[PDB]
Symmetry: C2
Subunit: 306 residues, 2 copies
């Protein structure tokens, strides 16, 4: 049992943020995607003749079990076609938990909805890097050995706003054991003294992407843990350094001066231009001249029935 702590797993972030214990309808959950995830399981149980308590119990079970996003593979856990077709065929972010009446693994299908899932923002040092190394931290709340990990990244055409995570949209970037090490005082994990920690080069994406992490136990039970992690790279602002022409080193003089550890925790207006007023009228232009409901003729054409 466990979950990704860095980058924080989707279901882990929803659990830690809370507000899901009361009210029972999930209206206290501040994140809209964690709220929509809760409310989808809640609403689904109600549709199937469940009571408010059975609906709230199934939705709360999905959030509470953030360390048990699991599926049993049996003794044939190394068979790729067995995992992709029988163990986790779909509902990848839920680890194929689709039965609210049967626990384990209940119904965690709320976690596979598409939309604006909050990501870990990784800033780029330079916008030209091909890969960014990240030190993955997997938090085991229960210690299980022997075990191995598989880390996947979504293909560049995956869209988190509209797409379900599928095996056909995932690229394997890691496979093998991850050594069990001592947590650092820094650790995002607080279950025991140990973590799974490793550097993985993450291929750069110009869009929000998903990192799929499978933690498989090498045993006849074949229990595997599957987690979705939402990530995004922040681009560095300014000119690309390689395009920047530098001035020659000069020394100048004249009576017109205009002619020549810790870190820090409207501006575009000039003496010859008012950006605030211009950008407000330009925002209005965007609204009325883009989309299926844009102004075409009504502000210029008058008609009557003859």
């Amino acid at each position: 049992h466990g979950y990704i702590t860095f980058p924080i797993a989707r279901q882990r972030r929803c659990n830690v943020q809370g507000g899901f214990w009361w009210p029972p309808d999930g209206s206290g959950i501040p994140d809209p995607m964690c709220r929509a995830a809760y409310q989808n399981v809640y609403n689904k149980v109600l549709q199937q003749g469940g009571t408010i308590d059975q609906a709230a119990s199934a939705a709360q079970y999905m959030f509470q079990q953030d360390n048990e996003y699991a599926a049993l593979a049996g003794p044939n856990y190394l068979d790729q076609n067995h995992i992709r077709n029988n163990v986790v065929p779909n509902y990848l972010c839920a680890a194929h938990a689709t039965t609210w009446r049967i626990r384990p693994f209940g119904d965690k299908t709320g976690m596979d909805v598409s939309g604006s899932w909050t990501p870990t923002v990784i800033p780029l040092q330079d916008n030209t890097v091909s890969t960014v190394p990240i030190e993955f931290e997997f938090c085991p709340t229960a210690i299980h050995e022997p075990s191995f990990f598989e880390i996947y990244i979504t293909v560049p055409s995956f869209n988190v706003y509209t797409d379900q995570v599928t095996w056909q949209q995932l690229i394997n970037i890691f496979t093998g054991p991850i050594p069990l090490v001592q947590r650092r005082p820094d650790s995002q994990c607080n279950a025991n003294n140990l973590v799974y920690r490793t550097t993985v080069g993450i291929p750069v994406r110009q869009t929000q992407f998903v990192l799929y992490v499978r933690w498989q136990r090498n045993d006849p039970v074949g229990e595997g843990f599957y987690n979705c992690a939402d990530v995004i790279f922040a681009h560095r602002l300014g000119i690309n350094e390689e395009d920047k022409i530098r001035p020659p080193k000069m020394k100048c003089k004249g009576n017109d001066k205009d002619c020549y550890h810790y870190h820090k925790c409207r501006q575009y207006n000039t003496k010859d231009f008012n950006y605030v007023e211009w950008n407000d009228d330009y925002s209005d232009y965007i609204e009325n001249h883009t989309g299926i409901n844009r102004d075409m003729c009504d502000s210029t054409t008058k008609c009557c029935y003859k």
Copy 2:
């Protein structure tokens, strides 16, 4: 002569924002990409033995001539291979103006630098749309007829932060005459009573992209006007509606109430979680455990020379 007013052309936005007349080194330009564009032409002239005035004159000529981002094609303006190889082979956003000593068309190469160019933000009604109609507005400051337009969009793999706009990264989405019509009171154009206005379905992009607009005169001179326009679609926040399970219409009662024109112009904290303090420590985690300078051993390992 003219420039795109909607979506605002790259060189038009830099000109309107101002701050480029004084100081002569361009330090008064508020937008970093307009400033880097100015300073690249300024610095280039200085490197070639130009004086501060010849450097400031060439950089100011690039900004001032926002309606003359032009190239002469000659009588064979319909020959695609003549345009892509001889007329505008490179420096597409500058309309291949590479000579500061010779006017027209001077040096406008500052406009082809890569980086965080400010885009027109177009909000999506739904994140599942394939195309978004926009009403293009081309502002003619000089009226020229007969003439035609070609509108291009960049390929999905184009990256504005690092890539030069090339013909190999552009997809033609419009070709033909655009009727000359009366400006609307709404108009972003203020040169004369007329504009070029048309609806074009813009293919959806999940990243910042460029719209390349070529306004060609049908005449033996074959003067063409070429403009880059930076654009981005804003995604709608929340759950994708198609994934949303709705509750059944119910009527409830009990003593615990928790159980059941014009428009408008920290929040994620709950009674059971402090997000502000958690998200500050998590931002610090990102900084120290991502990138080539992340902490690996130094906070845990002590060494000495024997």
